[PDB]
Amino acid sequence: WSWESYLEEQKAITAPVSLFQDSQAVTHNKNGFKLGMKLEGIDPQHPSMYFILTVAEVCGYRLRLHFDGYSECHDFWVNANSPDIHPAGWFEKTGHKLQPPKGYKEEEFSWSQYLRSTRAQAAPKHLFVSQSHSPPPLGFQVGMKLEAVDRMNPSLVCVASVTDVVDSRFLVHFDNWDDTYDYWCDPSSPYIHPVGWCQKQGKPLTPPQDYPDPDNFCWEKYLEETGASAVPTWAFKVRPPHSFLVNMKLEAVDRRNPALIRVASVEDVEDHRIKIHFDGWSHGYDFWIDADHPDIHPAGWCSKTGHPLQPPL
Amino acid sequence: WSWESYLEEQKAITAPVSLFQDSQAVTHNKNGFKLGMKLEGIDPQHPSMYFILTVAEVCGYRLRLHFDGYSECHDFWVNANSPDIHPAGWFEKTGHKLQPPKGYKEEEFSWSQYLRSTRAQAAPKHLFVSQSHSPPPLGFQVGMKLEAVDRMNPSLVCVASVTDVVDSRFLVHFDNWDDTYDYWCDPSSPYIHPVGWCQKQGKPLTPPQDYPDPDNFCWEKYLEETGASAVPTWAFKVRPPHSFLVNMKLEAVDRRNPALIRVASVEDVEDHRIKIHFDGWSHGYDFWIDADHPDIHPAGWCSKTGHPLQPPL
Amino acid sequence: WSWESYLEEQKAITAPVSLFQDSQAVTHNKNGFKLGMKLEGIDPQHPSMYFILTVAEVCGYRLRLHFDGYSECHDFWVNANSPDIHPAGWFEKTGHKLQPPKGYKEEEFSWSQYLRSTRAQAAPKHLFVSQSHSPPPLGFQVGMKLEAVDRMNPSLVCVASVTDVVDSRFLVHFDNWDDTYDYWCDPSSPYIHPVGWCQKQGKPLTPPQDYPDPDNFCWEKYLEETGASAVPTWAFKVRPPHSFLVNMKLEAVDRRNPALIRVASVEDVEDHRIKIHFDGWSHGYDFWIDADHPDIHPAGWCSKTGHPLQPPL
Amino acid sequence: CVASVTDVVDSRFLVHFDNWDDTYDYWCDPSSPYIHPVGWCQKQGKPLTPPQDYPDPDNFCWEKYLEETGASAVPTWAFKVRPPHSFLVNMKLEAVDRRNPALIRVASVEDVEDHRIKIHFDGWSHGYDFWIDADHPDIHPAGWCSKTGHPLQPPL
Amino acid sequence: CVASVTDVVDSRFLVHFDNWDDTYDYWCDPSSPYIHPVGWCQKQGKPLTPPQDYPDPDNFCWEKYLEETGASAVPTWAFKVRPPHSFLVNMKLEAVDRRNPALIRVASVEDVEDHRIKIHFDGWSHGYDFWIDADHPDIHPAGWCSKTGHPLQPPL
């Protein structure tokens, strides 16, 4: 199988490298992660929470992470340039809570002790793109409030708060809802708006879960009661729409079997998202994904990084 | 988008209309081809051979042709003023052979009966710019001999024959070779030369495939032996070099997906060819093309003919 | 009146929005068609033929179209997102034939000149959802063959051809028959089947009108003889049965006077059709309709688009 | 003149003059005395004015203008006969003053045609007398102002 | 372009382009395929070139221009259809040499339009080929030179 022969055969064009973020395209960085290394990272399902993680597998510029003490059914894959992982020690130096290995107490866990117990090595610091050392996102402080789209229920724009800040990004949290709805963004995210945006746009605003008087939610009173400030309007930036076009081909990780990356096509577009189709598979497996998502890549990425590529059905 | 605003922002000019052949520039002719019409035409991969074709798609002044009985994977695009297509009945009336639809036999095929059996419409004669109702190109009669550059292997100038004449054009065939290397041209073509030109210029001439005694190749006796005359030297006209300049902009079909036409730029020039660059794409997709190629057009061609134009990426 | 109070008094539910095609449900698009605008479209009684049409009336997201030069008794209603109407100039740019206004001749007609003579405005291109600017429905090329149910005589499955392709849809034509029986559909249509389906299912296949030797009807030789390919079986997709249930309420155009839309109920169901009952009217006016028909809509459609809703009688 | 229907709203439609500004347009209904079926001029004796800047004006042909514009003429059965009004000279009424339309005045019928009346404002000069269509929205029966709560200007 | 009749001599008239060099002027008759009545461009949807140095080049209007200039349009009835010529490609004839007008040469019809022919001088480069109106006084039937006593130049 080759991309060159397949494109000639299909009279098709790949999405150029120029349409991707540098982080999605870069193939010349080596993967320094090695089996058994220990580190810290967010649970992709609960992006506000941090766990002790171990490198269980490496494949090209990707690695599979295992939650120490928990079942292997929870293992997940990230790129070696992921900002959602951090070196041993990072949580304690930056004000983040550790969920310790199964059966430990928070107060009970110490990296020194754990590494002695396991005789394991911590992943070296120099591997990690994110250590909370770079300038923060301008204008977004922890504790400030804003209006945000519930990416799980995208018809809802909701009262939300900044609850975390790491390097150039911040975490959006939906007031008094499960942290499973939280997501990381930057100032240009198309999913966030200043306080007052819904009322100015004539959209209903979804109030906090279990808000005492759900009927008459008022931002001014809520901000006062909560000792909170709005993110100032100047901080919000326009992200330009992406330049991907329908029928362009690319490589995308399989959501159902994330170990796998497949030949894919752009099936549809929005301003900030693309709809992925896996060539040769049912359109029933098609899915929408943000254009900046870390698991889409230009054609060639797998061969240049050493990751196997699944040809079309 | 708009050419006008593009030219201002880029501080650039378009290749003037006068630089193009009338046939590449003409926008004011309507496309009278309709879905399902039947006709005859050359196979672009075997330019000496004629097949039954059906109009499968129309886009502006272009059409996509299907080889009757064969796979749709062979379909190809032409312009409505293509001289490489002819009305039903042309082959018989002009001394050409028709390769029939898949599963027929040359002499099993009758247009009357085919049309009855399909209930299809033959494309009307008046649509075609080439019907062999013009007197031939002066001095180029079938069977005559000349020296020609193998456009596939441009360092070779070779023993070649005229094997087909249609309106103002004729077919150049390489003696003892596949029709695969053949090409259509006219008497001003820069790829052809009178008998003796090589000798008189210094360059070696490639004789017919598997000729007896190749270095000892003698034209005046090849000629007497084949009962052929060389094309008279007075026949070969001087096409002047084109006047395209680097950085001029135009519109060009994308060879990767020929359904598409794009904003393009002149990246380089030779006497009779231009190197095309698609604005906003990698220089890796840059390609050489004959100045007189049917698939380059002046700015505004798409707009005036009703074909989409791909703006720069 | 109000849906809300109606549902309480009847102790009933409305057919949810999710049950409908997006095209049947969408209310938030404005109707940009204006009185007197000119365009092209199919004749609903001769679905293979295109005529010049004028906007005669606008009501909410619907419009009434007039055949230029002909009687107003032929006027008909469509939705503003109809794929059966196209901008001025479309026929020429896409290989379709235009039947001209009464008293003209196909080739006497020019849009430039018609617009000058009438001083009329062509409806702007951006209004149309169907302009042949999308790539076709996969595997369905013009001239290809299939088996189809005669929607007029549903016990018959018949030899049929693709004769028209426009955006995601194509026209099914019965071999040797009037266009009167033709219908538009897409590859998930439940009325179409690959070549051989009848034989493989047990049912008899109706051959072309006035074919020689009907019981002795052979597909692979009909095919070789017509220079046609059958539509490949991989092309035919499985539309799942709709999920409408008896007693769900909705809004539906009244076929007796199509200017009107009414409160309606699901009286019965098949896999791909629903039987409509108009609340407060006799069951004698109950009628069967395809679930995907453009003239059924979710509760609130009229209200959101600005079309009157007939309350129950 | 040659004219078209360009707008329809409820029981009314807009009459437009072909090749002319909308400045001359007017709304009416099928009983309007200002409109006529195609051919009426020819059949009555009067000359018909063709579209502005038409090619070859005296040689103006309707059935071919029609075929050429993909238009039909309004059918003759459509044009209804408004009967002449029954106002008589000296009857009194209330009428908006065109000089200052905020005002309505006591008025008199000074003259009549089949479909128009000439209005005189009692106590004012006959110089301000003006012609108006009987069906104009700005003439009203005596007592209209009083019953609707609009001041009535008494005679001067 | 906007133009005027500035001369009349026998059966012909001179066409002049308003406020342009008289070098652009040409003689014709009523059937000339190069002239049209006032309004033709607008009826055909072609741009009309206004007079040189027209005070407001943007909004040229024939009605106003005619009034300002004290001028009338040539009436439409005066313009006649000239039938296309009947010359066919490859027919041979005699034509004066534009470069050396003392000379008349053997010539061929290289191409045709409705009212013009393209002349090729047999034996010379097609680079010397030229379009000429079918009625031009310097093309002639074969034999014209010998019958009038003018030398004829044979083909190159």
Best probe of the C interface among B57, B78, B116, by most C CBs < 10 A, is: B57
How far is it, in rounded angstroms, from Cα C130 to Cα C168? Answer: 9
Burial of D150 (0-12, 13-18, 19+ CB in 10 A): middle
In chain E, what residues touch D56 (CB-CB under 8 Å)?
Answer: 76
Write out the CATH class of domain A30-133: mainly beta
In this complex, do E43 and D55 lie within 8 Å of one another by their Cβ atoms?
yes
In this complex, do B306 and C93 lie within 8 Å of one another by their Cβ atoms?
yes
Fold of A1-29+242-313: SH3 type barrels. (2.30.30)
3-state class (DSSP) for residue E28:
strand
3-state class (DSSP) for residue B77:
strand
Query: Under a CB-based contact definition with an 8 Å cutoff, are residues E54 and E61 in contact?
Result: no
Under DSSP, the state recorded for D99 is T
How near does any CA of chain D get to the CA of E66, in Å?
A: 14
In chain C, what residues touch D72 (CB-CB under 8 Å)?
Answer: 69, 71-72
Best probe of the C interface among D4, D68, D74, D77, by most C CBs < 10 A, is: D68
How near does any CA of chain B get to the CA of C208, in Å?
A: 11
Q: B64: which strand partners?
A: B57, B77
Q: Residue E18's CB: how many other CB atoms inside 10 A?
A: 18
Q: Which residue type, as a one-letter code, is found at position D14? A: L
In chain C, what residues touch B307 (CB-CB under 8 Å)?
Answer: 93
Q: Where does A134-241 sit in CATH, by number?
A: 2.30.30.140
Q: C264: which strand partners?
A: C250, C278
How far is it, in rounded angstroms, from Cα C165 to Cα C168? Answer: 8
How far is it, in rounded angstroms, from Cα C109 to Cα C99? Answer: 9
On whether any CB of chain D is under 8 Å from the CB of C114, the answer is: yes
A55 to each of A41, A58, C116, how far by Cα in Å? 11, 7, 74
Burial of D76 (0-12, 13-18, 19+ CB in 10 A): exposed
On whether any CB of chain C is under 8 Å from the CB of D68, the answer is: yes
Q: How many residues does chain C have?
A: 313
Q: How was this structure determined?
A: X-ray
Cβ density class A76-94: b for 16+ within 10 Å, e for less: bbbbbbbbbbbbbebbeee
How far is it, in rounded angstroms, from Cα C8 to Cα E98? Answer: 96
On whether any CB of chain C is under 8 Å from the CB of D70, the answer is: yes
Pick the CATH number of E85-156 from 2.30.30.140, 3.40.1350.10, 3.30.300.30, 3.40.50.2300: 2.30.30.140
Of A7, A12, A16, Cβ closest to residue B281? A16
- In angstroms, the first-to-last Cα distance of chain A is 12
The counts of H helices and E strands in chain A are 7, 17
Residue C98: closest C-alpha in chain B: B34
In order, the DSSP letters of chain C are --HHHHHHHHT--B--GGGS-HHHH--SS-----TT-EEEEEETTEEEEEEEEEEEEEETTEEEEEETTS-GGG-EEEETT-TTEE-TTHHHHHT--EE-STT--GGG--HHHHHHHHT--BPPGGG-S-SS-S---TT--TT-EEEEE-TTSTT-EEEEEEEEEETTEEEEEETTS-GGG-EEE-TT-TTEE-TTHHHHHT---B--TT-SSGGG--HHHHHHHTT--BPPGGG---PPPP---TT-EEEEE-TTSTT-EEEEEEEEE-SSEEEEEETTS-GGG-EEEETT-TTEE-TTHHHHHT---BPP-
In this complex, do E39 and D55 lie within 8 Å of one another by their Cβ atoms?
yes
In this complex, do E39 and D56 lie within 8 Å of one another by their Cβ atoms?
no
In this complex, do A13 and B257 lie within 8 Å of one another by their Cβ atoms?
yes
How far is it, in rounded angstroms, from Cα B158 to Cα A40? Answer: 71
Q: Which of C256, C255, C268 is nearest to C296 (CA)?
A: C255
In chain D, what residues touch C122 (CB-CB under 8 Å)?
Answer: none
B115 to each of A142, B110, B119, C178, how far by Cα in Å? 77, 9, 5, 17
In chain D, what residues touch C72 (CB-CB under 8 Å)?
Answer: 72
Q: How many CB pairs under 8 A join B and C?
A: 71
On whether any CB of chain E is under 8 Å from the CB of C118, the answer is: no
Q: How many CB pairs under 8 A join C and D?
A: 29
In this complex, do D70 and C36 lie within 8 Å of one another by their Cβ atoms?
no
- The interface residues of chain E toward chain C in range 20-59, judged by CB-CB distance below 8 A, are 43, 45
Query: Under a CB-based contact definition with an 8 Å cutoff, are residues A291 and A17 in contact?
Result: no
Of C52, C71, C117, Cβ closest to residue D68? C117
How far is it, in rounded angstroms, from Cα A223 to Cα C84? Answer: 53
Instruction: Supply angle C-alpha E98, E101, E106, rounded to 5.
Output: 75
Q: How many CB pairs under 8 A join C and E?
A: 4
How far is it, in rounded angstroms, from Cα C188 to Cα C237? Answer: 5
In chain A, what residues touch B259 (CB-CB under 8 Å)?
Answer: 11
- The interface residues of chain C toward chain E in range 94-113, judged by CB-CB distance below 8 A, are 112-113
Residue B123: closest C-alpha in chain C: C95
How far is it, in rounded angstroms, from Cα A87 to Cα A39? Answer: 5
Query: Under a CB-based contact definition with an 8 Å cutoff, are residues B153 and B159 in contact?
Result: no
Q: Residue C24's CB: how many other CB atoms inside 10 A?
A: 21
How far is it, in rounded angstroms, from Cα C138 to Cα C234? Answer: 9
Query: Under a CB-based contact definition with an 8 Å cutoff, are residues B78 and B42 in contact?
Result: no
Locate tokens 């107060």: which residue?
A107
In order, the DSSP letters of B129-163 are S-SS-S---TT--TT-EEEEE-TTSTT-EEEEEEE
Of A11, A16, A17, Cβ closest to residue B257? A11
How far is it, in rounded angstroms, from Cα C97 to Cα C11? Answer: 52
Query: Under a CB-based contact definition with an 8 Å cutoff, are residues A122 and A112 in contact?
Result: no
Q: Which of E11, E44, E13, E41 is nearest to E26 (CA)?
A: E13
- The interface residues of chain B toward chain A in range 243-262, judged by CB-CB distance below 8 A, are 254, 256-259
How far is it, in rounded angstroms, from Cα A210 to Cα A228? Answer: 19
How far is it, in rounded angstroms, from Cα C161 to Cα C171? Answer: 8
In chain A, what residues touch B57 (CB-CB under 8 Å)?
Answer: none
Residue D66: closest C-alpha in chain C: C69
The H-or-E segment that residue D42 falls in is: helix D40-44
Best probe of the B interface among A3, A9, A10, A11, by most B CBs < 10 A, is: A11
What's the alpha-carbon Rg for chain E, to the nearest Å? Answer: 20
Query: Would you kindly state where each structural domain of chain B is located, as residue ranges?
Result: 1-29+242-313, 30-133, 134-241
Write out the CATH class of domain D1-84: mainly beta
How far is it, in rounded angstroms, from Cα B128 to Cα E12? Answer: 42
Q: How many CB pairs under 8 A join A and B?
A: 18
- The interface residues of chain D toward chain E in range 133-152, judged by CB-CB distance below 8 A, are none
Q: Which residue type, as a one-letter code, is found at position C157? A: V
What's the alpha-carbon Rg for chain B, to the nearest Å? Answer: 21
How far is it, in rounded angstroms, from Cα C275 to Cα C286? Answer: 7
CATH fold match for the domains A1-29+242-313 and A134-241: yes
- The first and second tokens of residue D46, run together, are 């009067």
Of C133, C143, C225, Cβ closest to residue B117? C225
In this complex, do D6 and C57 lie within 8 Å of one another by their Cβ atoms?
no
How far is it, in rounded angstroms, from Cα E93 to Cα E121? Answer: 10
- The interface residues of chain B toward chain A in range 266-285, judged by CB-CB distance below 8 A, are 281-282
Question: Could you tell me where the DSSP H helices lie in A3-119?
Answer: 3-10, 22-25, 90-94, 111-118
Of A12, A16, A19, Cβ closest to residue B257? A12
In this complex, do B52 and C141 lie within 8 Å of one another by their Cβ atoms?
no
In this complex, do D53 and E76 lie within 8 Å of one another by their Cβ atoms?
no
Please, which chains are in contact with C (at least 3 CB pairs closer than 8 A)? B, D, E
